[PDB]
């Protein structure tokens, strides 16, 4: 019966160590952009989640409110904003979400969002900048951020002749163009979904193109698209976006891709998705986001609109990559931060070690000793070697009388005598405070 629920896994000490290094990079970035932080309960009223999703963990009806586990951090955010009658906020939220999909049922989401009425595209641009800072800093190899706008999509599908009835499914097909070829995608829309091959080929004339600001300029000249009001504003915003990206120094990491069509329940403005590269060959997505201006309005009692743009870093995939990067380097990932083991080779010294280890703790030094009265020096050394503990402070009967400690570097094997009074400052010096 010993088992974690399907789709969940524990984080082992080593996995926690990597998670800490990855979160530390991400949080340091969020904080650099003046983000506040909040937290919200792991479950919300079922009502709060109902009427938002077209796969949600519900809690047993036990005689109170009907409750559900958060499927994401964005809805809780909207509920939070509305509940506190906030009109603007810049926040990050790092927490687990829950989905009965098919470690994929419980996993971390890492969100940053900017809510408020501001001038066009400036916050949207900062979101892309934040993506890029983070992905670069993690050093998970090269990447590329795909960008599109919801209104460009709507307009493109309007003038190509896609019905409102098939709009939703056709986007699902187009959105596959990242992994698969246009030939497959075309054949699906036509063969499986009953889309006219005339419409399919027209969509193709747009959907197959990608590039930088150059493509935004071309489509602003497109005779058919120009005459669609929505596509035109969307393109105007992207043109603006590219200007700001250039100033942020990251226009070379951005690809305007008209096949990007996801999260169409939420997104009203830009849509983006970061993808890892090979060698530009897409190897998988590691972040996503966009502008969703209708969500908060759905919660505010007076339906007051609060624009929002934001991003989700896909940390689960990043945990794997970083873990494997570390493994391939023979770099032993430490699961503890102990700086020194207090040891002795002789017997009858437990009380002396207890006294020393405690002095070290008092000075704020990270120390341990074996829970054994007369451990063998070899066993203590082996313990340090496996744990990556860099120093061993060896206490002996004579050395105590002399007021010295034998300090041995575990890896270099070099041993030096240190005055007891100098021991605390000497350990700090060897580790870096």
């Amino acid at each position: 019966v010993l088992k974690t629920p399907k789709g969940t896994r524990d984080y082992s000490p080593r996995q926690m160590a990597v998670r800490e290094k990855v979160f530390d990079v991400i949080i340091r970035c969020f904080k650099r952009h003046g983000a506040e932080v909040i937290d919200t309960p792991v479950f919300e009223l079922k009502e709060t989640l109902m009427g938002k999703y077209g796969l949600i963990y519900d809690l047993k009806d036990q005689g109170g409110e009907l409750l559900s586990l958060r499927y994401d951090l964005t809805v809780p955010f909207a509920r939070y904003l509305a509940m506190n009658k906030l009109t603007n906020i810049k926040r990050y939220h790092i927490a687990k979400v829950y989905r009965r999909d098919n470690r994929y049922r419980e996993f971390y989401q890492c969100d940053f969002d900017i809510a408020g009425n501001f001038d066009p595209m400036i916050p949207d641009a900062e979101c892309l900048k934040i993506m890029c800072e983070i992905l670069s800093s993690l050093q998970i190899g090269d990447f590329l951020v795909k960008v599109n706008d919801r209104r460009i999509l709507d307009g493109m599908f309007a003038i190509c002749g896609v019905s409102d009835s098939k709009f939703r499914t056709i986007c699902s097909s187009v959105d596959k163009l990242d992994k698969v070829s246009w030939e497959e995608v075309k054949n699906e829309m036509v063969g499986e979904k009953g889309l006219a091959p005339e419409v399919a080929d027209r969509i193709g004339d747009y959907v197959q193109q990608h590039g930088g600001v150059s493509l935004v300029e071309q489509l602003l000249q497109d005779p058919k698209l120009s005459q669609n009001k929505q596509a035109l504003e969307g393109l105007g915003d992207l043109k603006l976006l590219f200007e700001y990206l250039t100033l942020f120094g990251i226009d070379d990491k951005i690809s305007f891709d008209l096949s990007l069509a996801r999260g169409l329940d939420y997104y009203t403005g830009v849509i983006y998705e970061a993808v890892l590269l090979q060698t530009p060959l897409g190897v998988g997505s590691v972040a996503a986001g966009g502008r969703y201006d209708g969500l908060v309005g759905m919660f505010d009692p007076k339906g007051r609109k609060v624009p929002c743009v934001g991003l989700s870093i896909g940390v689960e995939r990043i945990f794997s990559i970083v873990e494997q990067r570390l493994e391939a380097l023979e770099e032993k990932i430490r699961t503890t931060e102990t700086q020194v083991l207090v040891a002795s080779a002789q017997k009858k010294l437990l009380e002396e070690r207890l006294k020393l280890v405690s002095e070290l703790w008092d000075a704020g030094i990270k120390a341990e000793l074996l829970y054994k009265k007369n451990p063998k020096l070899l066993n203590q050394l082996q313990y340090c070697e496996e744990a990556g503990i860099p120093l061993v402070a060896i206490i002996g009967e004579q050395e105590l009388k002399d007021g010295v400690i034998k300090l041995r570097s575990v890896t270099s094997r070099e041993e030096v005598d240190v005055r007891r009074e100098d021991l605390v400052e000497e350990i700090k010096r060897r580790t870096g405070q």
Copy 2:
């Protein structure tokens, strides 16, 4: 007007579940400060960390206080009510016989922010020499309680074996152990007479028997009290009491070496968590609340292992929810504005048409690891930018103007002092670093 039914219905559902609440940025600043103290202590003691799913199999957690997940055609799941039972499952499942770990995570209880709340656990599992890990747990509690600077505190200590032997030697029947413990436990809230009456009148104990319990249970003291009970005519003939007292005497030797023997109060009325604890039991009290508990529980892991293999465990739980409030009140009483962001500088301008230049600059600052912001406006008024800083606690404003750009210069104004000085652009990163301490 009061508002349409449309409006009032929406307001009616704009809430967090009962007995839960969001953490605002202000409360997150407090919680981050508390957790930093605690985690720095855990790490200082060589602890590893693990994490477990918020829900375990229902069969694993066996109550009218445990959240169950709806049967949606699959496993029957429940939300965890603590971290110790997930730990035991974790040790048994991974066939570990020793681990020293801490775990900080929310737990869930349908009791009467009190249904979802943080537990901060530290545990040392494994077969070791007597009472050293136990001593270290008390040290850890003492380090943390001290560093949190939440006033003076005390740690009550007792042992299950001492209660066992003590009940035996003064007449209690073995089968009435638990309920008499439940009564004795309330002597930190209630008088001995109220307690006695509940044991005799309610619990069917004999008057003579309860009186002998009162002779011991009413007592609390230091290491000298341990020595006295080792001299006790009746107790010192009971094997359990003898072991229990022997171990406390030893614990005290180690607490003296750790310089915390003066914070420990041996208290015979401490009888908590007897579903778990097989050795030491303890509870920290703030002096003017239950702010940290723990003890040794050697049978729990054994109950999850198929071959019933025992793994000795001793640990502690820090009541982090009571501390959050105390610390927040400390901060608010100082009227010290709690910042919710770390921004060092706002990039600003008074003139129009400089958005592009603020974008370039703020991005330069970000690339240098400086915490910077700018208002999301094409042409903000300087006043609005300065007010934003004043309200948020941002100490510097970097003002870009057309002339400054030509001179390769940036006007850097202190938000508090209002003094503005010119700064060569290439020096800006360093000049900011200096003024904010980095």
